[PDB]
Each structure stands twice: as C-alpha cells, then as structure tokens.
Amino acid sequence: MAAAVRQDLAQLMNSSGSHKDLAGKYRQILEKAIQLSGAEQLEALKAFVEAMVNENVSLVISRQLLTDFCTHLPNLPDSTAKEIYHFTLEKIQPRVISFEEQ
Amino acid sequence: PSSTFAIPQELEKSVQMFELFYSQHFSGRKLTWLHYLCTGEVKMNYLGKPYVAMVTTYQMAVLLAFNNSETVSYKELQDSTQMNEKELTKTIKSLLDVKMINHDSEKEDIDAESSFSLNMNFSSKRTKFKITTSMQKDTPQEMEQTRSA
Amino acid sequence: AAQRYNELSYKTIVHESERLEALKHALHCTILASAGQQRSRMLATLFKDERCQQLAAYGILEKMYLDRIIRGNQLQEFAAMLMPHQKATTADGSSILDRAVI
Amino acid sequence: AKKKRFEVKKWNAVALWAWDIVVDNCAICRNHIMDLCIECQANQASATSEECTVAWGVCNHAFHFHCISRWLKTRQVCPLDNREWE
Ligand SMILES: [Zn+2]
Ligand SMILES: [Zn+2]
Ligand SMILES: [Zn+2]
C-alpha cells in the first residue's frame, strides 16, 4: 500500500510532546527528507507545510521556517513546487492575516 | 502602531471569520482595521460555581504553554512574537510597578522565561486601600500621555 | 494610443529599439484608425521622421499624407504588416482597420 | 487552584483615524472631495462627500471637467485615473 511514507511521517508527528519536540523533529527530519528525491521528497514538502499549520507551533516559528522554506525553494522541481504553493495557500488562507509575508 | 500579536483561532473566529461575513454585511463599506474589540469573558467551572470574569493577556499564553508543555522559553518565544517595542518603556514601567502579575522574572531588557506562575492573586491586598488591580495604566493613562498630543 | 506611442518614441532616455518600437506602434495607431484632426497632426508629425522612413509602412503613411484613397494593394501590404490581434474582424463586417480604411 | 488565571480580556490601544481608503480629491484641480467645485456649479449636481466632481464608471477618469479636460487636450493620455477626461 502507498500509505507507508505518510504513515512514517505521521508516526514522527504522533509525539504529543512539546513544540520544541515536534519542531526539532520536523526541522531536522524534513530538512533531510525535503532535500531527498521522489515520493519521500513530495511527502516531506507536504508534511513540513502541514507541520507548520498549528498554533502550538506558534506563528513566527512557522513564518520563520517558511521563510527558510522559501530560501530552500530553488532545490525543488517546478510541478512539486506548484503543488506546494497550492496546498500552502490552502493552509495560509485560514491565517493569511498572520502569514501575509508568506 | 501596535505590536505584532499571534492572534489565535478564537481571536480569528471572533474577528477574521467576521471579516468573511462582514463582506456579507457590508459589500462596499470597506474595512479600517481595529483589533481593540477583541472580547473575552470567562465562564469557568474550575470550582463548583461557574464564574464570569476578566483577566490579563499573558497567562493565557502560559495556559497554552501548559497544554503543550510546562514551559515556553523566551528565546524561541521571542523569536516567534517580535513585538514592536514602541510603547515598551511605558509597558515596562507598568509591569515592574504592578508586581500583581505572577511572572517568572522581570528583567530590564529581556525576560528570559515566560512560563508564568499560577493564580496567586485575588482582588485586593487590603480593604482600606492597597486595593489596586486589574492592570490600570494602559486604561486611563492614554489621555494622560496624549495631553501633549 | 498614438500620442502615447509617438511621444514615447520621441524621448531619448529609453533604449533605441524601444524608441522605434513605440514609433512603429505609433504607425500602427496611424493606419489602424482613420484620421481625427489632432490624430492627423500626430500622423504628419510621424511623416517628418526619418526613422519612420526606416519603418516598413512609410508608403502607407505617405498615402495618408498625400490624401490618397487606399486601394487593396497597399491595404494588403500593411495587412501583411499587422499583428493578428490587430487583424480583428469582430462581427463588424470588414475589420476595424478596414472600416477605418473605408 | 484554578479560578482566575488570566484568560481573554477586552483591550484597547490606538488604531485608526478618517480612514485608509484614500480616496482622493480629484487631484488635477483639487477642490475638496466633499466640496461642490466650479465645474459642478453650472452643473450643480447632488454631490457626495467623496464626490467633488467624480464619476469612476466606464468614464472612469472624471475630475473637474474643464481642468481635467485641459490636462486632456494637450495630450490625450490623461493618466491620473488613466482615461479620457470628463
Ligand atoms: Zn463650492
Ligand atoms: Zn466643468
Ligand atoms: Zn469627487
């Protein structure tokens, strides 16, 4: 089944610890996996965007790491970047007031 | 100019969601932004009798800190907040002078930790006087400051 | 648009290709409509340009200048010189160019 | 224990005013955007507090008629709202 990579990053999200826990885990693991290639690349792009939606992940951690993500942006191909900008708009327009810079 | 506040979901749903319906309310009567109306009334059943009351802004963040962890360190926290520190001089004077607020440590430049204490205080110290709390200064003082203006 | 393109072609701060680009669009605005009076003044001002003599349709502006009824030959000449959006016959019979030629 | 631990308050600082829709005064000649101008004196229209002489429809660049028209006649690109002058 194709739910394996989603299950792995969901297991890395299943920690109910602090914001420092989830934030450090996803910073390091998806700085690793975003800079990979293929399905794990795509799902790491989606999972970092989805990890930066929270309010427990408070907003200028999300804003700052998305500024960092927009500097990592030329590492990505164009179509995966397109889908990133689609789903990232989909997470911004809830709190577009907070993420006008994004 | 005011500082940059995170504005959480309830704050969002109060105002921003309102902005959605506001378009429905006024189509063509545009918006000049005013956060000030953020409303809060708490009905809490911590103790047998639901109480409706009003309190300060910081511990709410602490409560959020508690839900997630015990503490929120100021380094990342400061990284996250970035308040515009125009008013800060007056703010600092008020926070230091009050000492009603249960805080970790009030230092001049940067407060290293903002994972504030529990509900230490009630309405007043004494009855004759020594009465003064909620945090008054912002409230009547504005004109007091504004008189020059 | 004729005064726009022409007096942008007369300024000297812009690149030379962009000057003659504004000039050739002023010649487009010469031929595509028929002459209004200040329009015709700007067309005769275009007629005094050697750079317009460098343009392809200076014979068309010449026949505009000599008050000549345009025959189908030079009509089809500058019709070869148009852009296809400027070749718009939008249910008016003959084109905006051609109705203005009439 | 937990009876008053500092949750949502009303809080007010200074925000506004006057607003930041601009909306501007028909700037070619600039009688006030409430004021009836000279060009609306022989006209004498019921004019809005943001309509000195303003029609931003399809005509879209409508200021004080002969003054916006004098900014129109010497070169027909009248660029403040960028159309022909009313
Ligand atoms: Zn008047
Ligand atoms: Zn007038
Ligand atoms: Zn007006």
From Swiss-Prot, chain B:
It is found in: Nucleus. GO terms for biological process: G1/S transition of mitotic cell cycle; intrinsic apoptotic signaling pathway; protein ubiquitination; SCF-dependent proteasomal ubiquitin-dependent protein catabolic process; ubiquitin-dependent protein catabolic process via the C-end degron rule pathway. The keyword Ubl conjugation applies. Keywords: Acetylation, Host-virus interaction, Isopeptide bond, Nucleus, Phosphoprotein, Ubl conjugation, Ubl conjugation pathway. Changing D138K: Activates UBE2R2-mediated ubiquitin chain extension in the absence of neddylation. One of its GO terms (cellular component) is SCF ubiquitin ligase complex. The keyword Nucleus applies. Neddylated; which enhances the ubiquitination activity of ECS (Elongin BC-CUL2/5-SOCS-box protein) E3 ubiquitin-protein ligase complexes. Neddylation leads to structural rearrangment in the complex that allows interaction between the E2 ubiquitin-conjugating enzyme and the acceptor ubiquitin. CBC(VHL) complex formation seems to promote neddylation. Deneddylated via its interaction with the COP9 signalosome (CSN) complex. The modification Phosphothreonine is found at T139. Changing K99R: No effect on conjugation with NEDD8. Coiled coil: none annotated. GO terms for molecular function: protein-macromolecule adaptor activity; ubiquitin ligase complex scaffold activity; ubiquitin protein ligase binding; ubiquitin-protein transferase activity. Component of multiple Cul2-RING (CRL2) E3 ubiquitin-protein ligase complexes consisting of CUL2, Elongin BC (ELOB and ELOC), RBX1 and a variable substrate-specific adapter; this complex is also known as ECS (Elongin BC-CUL2/5-SOCS-box protein) complex and may consist of CUL2 or CUL5. Component of a ECS(VHL) or CBC(VHL) complex containing CUL2, RBX1, ELOB, ELOC and VHL. Component of the ECS(MED8) complex with the probable substrate recognition component MED8. Belongs to the cullin family. Core component of multiple cullin-RING-based ECS (ElonginB/C-CUL2/5-SOCS-box protein) E3 ubiquitin-protein ligase complexes, which mediate the ubiquitination of target proteins. CUL2 serves as a rigid scaffold in the complex and may contribute to catalysis through positioning of the substrate and the E2 ubiquitin-conjugating enzyme. The E3 ubiquitin-protein ligase activity of the complex is dependent on the neddylation of the cullin subunit and is inhibited by the association of the deneddylated cullin subunit with TIP120A/CAND1. The Cullin neddylation domain restrains the RING domain of RBX1 in the E3 ubiquitin-protein ligase complex; this restraint is removed upon neddylation of the cullin. This is Cullin-2. The gene is CUL2. The chain holds residues 523 to 671 of 745 of the full protein.
From Swiss-Prot, chain C:
Belongs to the CSN4 family. Component of the COP9 signalosome complex (CSN), a complex involved in various cellular and developmental processes. The CSN complex is an essential regulator of the ubiquitin (Ubl) conjugation pathway by mediating the deneddylation of the cullin subunits of SCF-type E3 ligase complexes, leading to decrease the Ubl ligase activity of SCF-type complexes such as SCF, CSA or DDB2. Also involved in the deneddylation of non-cullin subunits such as STON2. It comes from Homo sapiens (Human). Residues 1-102 form the PCI domain. It is found in: Cytoplasm; Nucleus; Cytoplasmic vesicle, Secretory vesicle, Synaptic vesicle. Component of the CSN complex, composed of COPS1/GPS1, COPS2, COPS3, COPS4, COPS5, COPS6, COPS7 (COPS7A or COPS7B), COPS8 and COPS9 isoform 1. In the complex, it probably interacts directly with COPS1, COPS2, COPS3, COPS5, COPS6, COPS7 (COPS7A or COPS7B) and COPS8. Interacts with TOR1A; the interaction is direct and associates TOR1A and SNAPIN with the CSN complex. Interacts with STON2; controls STON2 neddylation levels. Interacts with ERCC6. The gene is COPS4. The chain holds residues 204 to 305 of 406 of the full protein. This is COP9 signalosome complex subunit 4.
